[PDB]
Amino acid sequence: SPNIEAILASYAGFRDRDIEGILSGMHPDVEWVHPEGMGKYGLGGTKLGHAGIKEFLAHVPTVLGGMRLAPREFIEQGDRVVVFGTREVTSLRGTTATLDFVHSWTMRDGKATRMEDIFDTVAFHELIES
Ligand SMILES: O=C1C(O)=C(c2ccccc2)[C@H](O)C(O)=C1c1ccccc1
Numbered sequence: 001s002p003n004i005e006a007i008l009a010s011y012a013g014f015r016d017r018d019i020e021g022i023l024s025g026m027h028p029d030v031e032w033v034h035p036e037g038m039g040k041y042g043l044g045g046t047k048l049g050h051a052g053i054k055e056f057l058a059h060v061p062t063v064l065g066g067m068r069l070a071p072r073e074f075i076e077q078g079d080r081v082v083v084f085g086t087r088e089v090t091s092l093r094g095t096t097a098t099l100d101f102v103h104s105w106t107m108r109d110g111k112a113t114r115m116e117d118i119f120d121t122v123a124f125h126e127l128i129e130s
Contacts, residue, residue: 003081003107004074010112014069019057023050031114032056037121041128063128066090069101081105095130099123 006025013021031046032053038044041063047056060067071085083103090096099119106114 002110006110007081007105011069011071025112027111027113030112033116035121065092079107089127091127091130097127
């Protein structure tokens with residue numbers, strides 16, 4: 001399916017620490033959204049476009065030692081896809097946790113116009129501070 005394979009190309013880019021692969025599913029106008037409760041670490045709110053994603057990704061190593069995604073379920077209807085999964089998150093002190101994620105994708109002409117990450121920010125903060 002065409003929306004799904006563009007989403008997978010992006011997840012593959014993340015797996016391979018490959019920004020070009022990540023953007024290979026994103027529209028230039030894409031909206032990149034993370035919970036407002038990550039504002040304390042400078043990772044909340046909306047970033048715009050390919051440049052905004054790079055800004056976000058350049059900040060992450062300031063907060064975390066590592067992250068690995070495991071998408072598990074894809075629910076699709078139209079230009080919307082919701083992906084449920086887990087991720088391994090490593091703190092700057094080497095502590096590692098498995099946490100849940102939901103990615104809500106909005107597509108058009110085969111690329112993402114919006115990707116929003118929704119997750120338990122308290123549990124995430126607890127990992128960051130451990
Ligand atoms: O690129 C990230 C990112 O770096 C993550 C993150 C890091 C720190 C705090 C909150 C989220 C997400 O784990 C993560 O799903 C993404 C991602 C989503 C879709 C395609 C490619 C990558």
